[PDB]
């Protein structure tokens, strides 16, 4: 079991060696921490045990072109390996995927991301099918579906029918999937909601915009070295990082106004009244949680879409204290929530909030359409407990929401009390609710494809990318 602590003088040398690694190879300190470094390191203590202190590691060590190639091999390896387990879940109908497009920022190749989502015992696989180049082809619907199918046919999946896709609404992808099950990414719809509700309340949105430029100025004026917080720019595509910006302007407020006025540029300090800001960061702060709770890939997401929506309506519940500029937003939101989000919703959404057992109220008409849905799947399609019964049997379920409630677990551990229903919630709750996975994926491609790494080929990135998703879901 236990392993040798080495001596104070042997510790002391592992310092001054790795210290020199950092220097002569110009690497970041953080890389000693590597969970692949550390294991790689163990394999080189073991080759010390059994070949001892005199070994020529020149020829032992690979060239990096062998690592490049090994990396493409191991990649093809594990792709066909668990390509079986894949083809299973997709025909168990518990298959949903996320897809989005992206462009590297040096070569400017156009790219399609795909991740897959299915449950496996109690686990929830979220993993990268592929990121593959459209090459320089034209980024239309079919080239997407072309490469799309291409991605699945490495796993021999030739049928996308049963696959519920969740995606943003780009005209491209929207009709790239026009002939499949298609679910709208809920993190986007929210953003749509929010940024239209600001378009339409320029009473506020004039300062917001005005803020956006104080950042842009300070940044170009090269200020902020006197701040104690750096002003955070709003980035156009990311979720009202407006909230981030406001908060950041919000903290240096006196220092800004001063520095702005004291450089005479106070012609930029235009709209005063910090207090209407403070309310918006107060408003925007609560949506932060919703976005977070919405893109979660570690546990179910979809079924919390609905309660979040009314959660939005409840942030925006009208108020008498509202200054007239605030009051307007609240309604510009709620309206938008209705006509943008709730109305770009689907049946999988309201079925998925059914399967939170403390749904008493979802009733509406809803369970009408839900039953018709739920039944329409259940009976024939499984490709002493009747199918139409388990429903009302379910309705008599009553739970209290608890500090730790896992709806993930309640179902395998309520199973067989609804042995045809236990197979729905297991299948719908694996559905991710947002196209986040793809973005998360793109984020990681971005640190592969870098200024100095720029020659890297489409296959080494995709291979590099799968592989790290692979040791992620399958290996401890």
Partner DNA sequence: GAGAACAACAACAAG
Partner DNA sequence: CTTGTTGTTGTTCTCTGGGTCACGC
Partner DNA sequence: GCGTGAC
Window 176-195: residues binding a second copy (CB under 8 A): none
Residues 317-346 that bind DNA (CB under 7 A): 340
Question: What does DSSP assign to residue 116?
Answer: E
Segments in 263-358 forming alpha helices (H): 274-295, 305-315, 324-336, 347-354
Residues 201-240 that bind DNA (CB under 7 A): 220-222, 224, 227-230, 232-233, 235-238
Question: What does DSSP assign to residue 3?
Answer: -
According to the annotation, is 168 in a ligand binding site?
yes
Decide if residue 82 touches a second copy (CB under 8 A): no
Decide if residue 444 touches a second copy (CB under 8 A): yes
Placement of tokens 């407006």 in the chain: 242
Element (H, E) at 110: strand 110-118
CA nearest neighbour of 122 among 299, 301, 296, 374: 299
Residues 417-446 that bind DNA (CB under 7 A): 440, 443-444
Tell me, residue by residue from 11 to 40, as one string, x for binding to a second copy by CB under 8 A and - for no binding: x-xxxxxxxxxxxxxxxxxxxxxxxxxxxx
454 binds, among DNA, a second copy, none (CB under 5 to 8 A by kind): DNA
8 Å CB contact between 318 and 330: yes
8 Å CB contact between 247 and 232: yes
Residues 118-177 that bind a second copy (CB under 8 A): 136
Tell me, residue by residue from 52 to 71, as one string, x for binding to a second copy by CB under 8 A and - for no binding: xxxxxxxxxxxxxxxxx-xx
Decide if residue 23 touches DNA (CB under 7 A): no
189 binds, among a second copy, DNA, none (CB under 5 to 8 A by kind): DNA
Give the interface size with DNA as a residue count (CB under 7 A): 78
- Rounded to a whole number of angstroms, the minimum distance from the CB of residue 343 to DNA is 10
Decide if residue 110 touches DNA (CB under 7 A): yes
- Rounded to a whole number of angstroms, the minimum distance from the CB of residue 416 to DNA is 35
8 Å CB contact between 441 and 115: yes
CA nearest neighbour of 444 among 94, 32, 127, 27: 127
Question: What does DSSP assign to residue 201?
Answer: -
142 binds, among a second copy, DNA, none (CB under 5 to 8 A by kind): DNA
- Rounded to a whole number of angstroms, the minimum distance from the CB of residue 92 to a second copy is 29
Phi, psi at 100, each rounded to 5° = -155, 170
Decide if residue 106 touches a second copy (CB under 8 A): no
Burial of 431 (0-12, 13-18, 19+ CB in 10 A): buried
Tell me, residue by residue from 374 to 413, as one string, x for binding to DNA by CB under 7 A and - for no binding: ----------------------------------------
Token reading at 135: 């090459």
The residue range among 116-124, 146-154, 187-195, 385-393 that interacts with DNA, by the rule CB under 7 A, is 187-195
Token reading at 456: 């890297």
Q: Could you give the CA distance from residue 221 to residue 214 in angstroms, rounded to a whole number? A: 10
Decide if residue 70 touches DNA (CB under 7 A): yes
Element (H, E) at 125: strand 125-135
Decide if residue 47 touches DNA (CB under 7 A): no
Tell me, residue by residue from 271 to 310, as one string, x for binding to DNA by CB under 7 A and - for no binding: ---------------------x--x---------------
Decide if residue 15 touches DNA (CB under 7 A): yes
10 binds, among a second copy, DNA, none (CB under 5 to 8 A by kind): a second copy
According to the annotation, is 100 in a ligand binding site?
yes
Decide if residue 68 touches DNA (CB under 7 A): yes
- Rounded to a whole number of angstroms, the minimum distance from the CB of residue 182 to DNA is 12
CA nearest neighbour of 33 among 43, 18, 47: 18
- Rounded to a whole number of angstroms, the minimum distance from the CB of residue 136 to a second copy is 5
Total Cβ atoms within 10 A of residue 185: 25
Tell me, residue by residue from 214 to 253, as one string, x for binding to a second copy by CB under 8 A and - for no binding: --------x--xx---------------------------
Exposure string for 4-41, b = 16+ CB within 10 A, e = fewer: eeeeeeeeeeeeeebeeeeeeeeeeeeeeeeeeeeeee
Decide if residue 398 touches a second copy (CB under 8 A): no
CA nearest neighbour of 434 among 110, 186, 79: 186
Token reading at 119: 């449950």
Annotated binding site for Ca(2+): 100, 168
């Amino acid at each position: 079991r236990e392993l040798k602590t080495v001596s104070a003088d042997c510790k002391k040398e592992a310092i001054e060696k790795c210290a020199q690694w950092v220097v002569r190879d110009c690497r970041p300190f953080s890389a000693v921490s590597g969970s692949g470094f550390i294991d790689m390191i163990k394999f080189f203590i073991k080759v010390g045990a059994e070949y001892g202190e005199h070994v020529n590691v020149e020829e032992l060590l690979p060239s990096p072109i062998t690592l490049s190639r090994k990396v493409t091999s191991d990649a093809k390896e594990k792709k066909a390996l668990i390509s079986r387990e894949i083809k299973s879940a997709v025909e168990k109908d518990g298959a949903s995927a996320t897809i989005d497009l992206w462009t590297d920022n040096y070569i400017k190749r156009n790219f399609l991301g795909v991740t897959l989502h299915y449950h496996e015992n109690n686990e929830l696989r979220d993993l990268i099918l592929g990121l593959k180049s459209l090459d320089f082809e034209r980024s239309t619907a079919e080239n997407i579906y072309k490469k799309l199918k291409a991605i699945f046919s490495q796993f021999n999946v030739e049928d996308l029918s049963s696959i519920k896709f969740v995606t943003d609404r780009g005209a491209n992808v929207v009709k790239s999937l026009a002939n499949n099950i298609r679910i709208n990414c809920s993190s986007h719809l929210l953003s749509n909601v929010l940024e239209n509700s600001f378009e339409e309340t320029p009473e506020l949105n004039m300062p917001i915009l005005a803020c956006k430029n104080i950042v842009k100025y300070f940044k170009k004026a090269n200020l902020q070295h006197r701040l104690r917080s750096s002003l955070k720019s709003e980035c156009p595509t990311r979720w009202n990082s407006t909230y981030t910006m406001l908060r950041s302007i919000l903290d240096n407020w006196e220092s800004v106004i001063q520095i702005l006025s004291e450089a005479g540029e106070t012609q930029r300090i235009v709209h005063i009244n910090k207090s209407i800001i403070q309310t918006m960061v107060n408003i925007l702060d609560g949506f932060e949680r919703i976005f977070k709770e919405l893109q979660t890939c570690s546990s179910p997401s979809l079924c919390f879409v609905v309660p979040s929506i009314l959660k939005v309506k409840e942030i925006c519940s009208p108020d008498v204290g509202d200054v007239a500029d605030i009051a307007k937003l609240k309604v510009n939101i709620i309206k938008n929530v209705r006509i943008i989000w709730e109305e770009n919703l689907s049946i999988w959404h309201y079925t998925a909030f059914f399967f939170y057992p403390p749904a008493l109220h979802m009733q509406q008409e809803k369970v009408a359409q839900i039953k018709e849905f739920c039944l329409s799947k259940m009976e024939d399609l499984e490709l002493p407990v009747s199918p139409s019964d388990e429903f009302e049997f379910y309705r008599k379920e009553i739970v209290i929401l608890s500090e730790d409630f896992k709806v993930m677990e309640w179902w395998n551990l309520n199973s067989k009390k609804y042995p045809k229903l236990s197979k729905l919630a297991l299948s719908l709750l694996s559905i991710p609710a947002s196209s986040a996975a793809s973005e998360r994926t793109f984020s990681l491609a971005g640190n592969i494809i870098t200024e100095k790494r720029n020659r890297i080929g489409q296959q080494t990135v995709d291979s590099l990318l799968f592989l790290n998703s692979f040791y992620k879901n399958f290996c401890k």
